């Protein structure tokens, strides 16, 4: 089912590559930087889990 | 070569290593808007 995974694999980059933009911009304008944005704690804690799906699955997948 | 579960991401695996250079370039653009304060 590597295709099922491979879509989830690319879903890492897609979500990462935006957080690549989002995190700095979150710090760009200090107004409501840490005030308005908890999305880091919302995205990051969800982002780290998107790493574990990679290997542990592929170890069984491939 | 590259694993089969990963078999295709052609451009990404083709060019990762160039982007480190791009940071040096980014610095100038990030100076360009700042404009050499």
């Amino acid at each position: 089912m590597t295709i099922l995974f491979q879509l989830a694999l690319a879903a890492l980059v897609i979500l990462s590559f935006v957080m690549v933009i989002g995190v700095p911009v979150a710090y760009a304008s200090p107004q409501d930087w840490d005030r308005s944005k908890q999305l880091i704690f919302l995205g990051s804690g969800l982002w780290i889990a998107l790493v574990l799906v990679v290997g542990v699955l592929n170890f069984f997948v491939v | 070569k590259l694993p089969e579960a990963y078999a295709i991401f052609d451009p990404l695996v083709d060019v990762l290593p160039v982007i480190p250079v791009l940071f040096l370039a980014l610095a100038f653009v990030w100076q360009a808007a700042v404009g050499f304060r």
Binding site: A28, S29, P30 | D10, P11, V15, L26, A33
Partner: peptide, 29 residues
């Protein structure tokens, strides 16, 4: 090699995005 530049453009142009938006919204640059 048909999409080598495709993805490259995507990421290559992504850098400027940071400078663009920041400058656009006039953030602490």
């Amino acid at each position: 090699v048909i999409a080598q530049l495709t993805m490259i453009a995507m990421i290559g142009i992504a850098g400027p995005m940071i400078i663009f938006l920041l400058a656009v919204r006039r953030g602490n640059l």
